Design a protein around this ligand. Structure first.
Ligand code: BOG
Ligand code: BOG
Lengths: 48, 149
């Protein structure tokens, strides 16, 4: 019914590995860049 | 420029205004004012300079005459080395849309007086030069940044 079966699971593996690693990486870079904002500090200093 | 310094160095001596805080000015004392001169205006840390119609000799003497107060210990002979300041890639943005125009200062950490490259760096700055709306060369100026401006 599904000759592929095997090769498909062999893929799932490869996919899970790349996946996990590449998501981790991206997550860093996302944070990294965004840091600039999340670290940001602001003050309201009028002239009074 | 002040704000520039204040973030460029932040948490270091260089990140301070030369005019000082508003508080400090309000409360500095006959005391501290003394102390500065006291601790800071000292011979080794000074240079008597002159140029014009004067002979080194004559000058040098007058100095020998008023620049008295000889140092006892060795501390008074020691030139205090300053704790260096940390450069920090960052920014500070003071927004006021009621301000007619806007100012922007961008910079990188420098090498310090000593380093020779300071010369090159200058040669560079010479290429990007400077400009104000009254330069006459206008669109023909040589500084690419100028022209475009
Ligand atoms: C399970 O193995 C798979 O067998 C296929 C052929 O049967 C190949 O084309 C795949 O590259 C291989 O991973
Ligand atoms: C999130 C993105 C995941 C991409 C995962 C790439 C997986 C593709 O991997 C595939 O595995 C098969 C089985 O061995 C091979 O026959 C194919 O040639 C190979 O390209």
């Amino acid at each position: 019914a599904e000759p592929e079966h095997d090769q498909r699971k062999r893929m799932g593996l490869k996919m899970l590995l790349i996946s996990a690693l590449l998501t981790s990486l991206l997550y860093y870079m996302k944070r990294h860049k965004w840091s600039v904002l999340k670290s940001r500090k602001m003050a309201y200093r009028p002239p009074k | 420029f002040d704000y520039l310094h204040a973030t460029a160095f932040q948490g270091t001596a260089l990140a301070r205004t030369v005019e000082g805080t508003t508080e400090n000015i309000k409360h500095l004392t006959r005391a501290d004012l003394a102390s500065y001169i006291d601790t800071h205006f000292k011979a080794p840390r000074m240079v008597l300079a002159a140029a014009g119609g004067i002979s080194h000799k004559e000058l040098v003497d007058a100095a020998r005459q008023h620049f008295s107060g000889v140092s006892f210990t060795y501390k008074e002979d020691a030139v205090p080395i300053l704790p260096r300041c940390r450069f920090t890639g960052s920014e500070i943005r003071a927004r006021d849309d009621a301000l007619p125009v806007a100012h922007v200062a961008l910079a990188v950490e420098g090498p310090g007086w000593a380093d020779p490259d300071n010369v090159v760096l200058h040669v560079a700055n010479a290429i990007i030069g400077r400009y104000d709306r009254t330069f006459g060369g206008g669109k023909h100026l040589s500084s690419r940044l100028a022209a475009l401006a």
